[PDB]
Amino acid sequence: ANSFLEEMKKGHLERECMEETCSYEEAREVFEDSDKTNEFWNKYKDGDQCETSPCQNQGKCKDGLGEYTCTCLEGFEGKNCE
Amino acid sequence: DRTRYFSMWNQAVDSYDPDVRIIENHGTEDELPNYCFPLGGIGITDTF
Ligand SMILES: [Ca+2]
Ligand SMILES: [Ca+2]
Ligand SMILES: [Ca+2]
């Protein structure tokens, strides 16, 4: 993950953030983008969480570090649009 | 003789190395090369 050269060479996602802990930034360095910085790094150890689409009734998903947000449309709500 | 310098009256002749005026470019001794190494002596270990 870290070394004298692991973080001195070119930043590639096919290198640093994959086979250790991927603590931080090494998922942001590759892209230079703090938008999905903490909406994807939660999916390094335990697997994805929105791939099941818990929200039904045409509701979008949002991943948080422990709980899932389900955006349901006007007049629709719920923990999973439930 | 002239080579010795005398400090009574700043007695010293103008000099120049001969190699400067005419070089004798033998080349070098480029045999078994040299290297630099990490300060700890091990580049990067890999937890096992
Ligand atoms: Ca690596
Ligand atoms: Ca990176
Ligand atoms: Ca990295």
From TrEMBL, chain B:
It is found in: Host nucleus; Virion. Induction: Expressed in the late phase of the viral replicative cycle. Coiled coil: none annotated. Transmembrane segments: none annotated. Major capsid protein that self-associates to form 240 hexon trimers, each in the shape of a hexagon, building most of the pseudo T=25 capsid. Assembled into trimeric units with the help of the chaperone shutoff protein. Transported by pre-protein VI to the nucleus where it associates with other structural proteins to form an empty capsid. Might be involved, through its interaction with host dyneins, in the intracellular microtubule-dependent transport of incoming viral capsid to the nucleus. Homotrimer. Interacts with the capsid vertex protein; this interaction binds the peripentonal hexons to the neighboring penton base. Interacts with the hexon-linking protein; this interaction tethers the hexons surrounding the penton to those situated in the central plate of the facet. Interacts with the hexon-interlacing protein; this interaction lashes the hexons together. Interacts with host dyneins DYNC1LI1 and DYNC1I2; this interaction might be involved in intracellular microtubule-dependent transport of incoming viral capsid. Belongs to the adenoviridae hexon protein family. All late proteins expressed from the major late promoter are produced by alternative splicing and alternative polyadenylation of the same gene giving rise to non-overlapping ORFs. A leader sequence is present in the N-terminus of all these mRNAs and is recognized by the viral shutoff protein to provide expression although conventional translation via ribosome scanning from the cap has been shut off in the host cell. This is Hexon protein. The gene is Hexon. The chain holds residues 387 to 434 of 963 of the full protein.
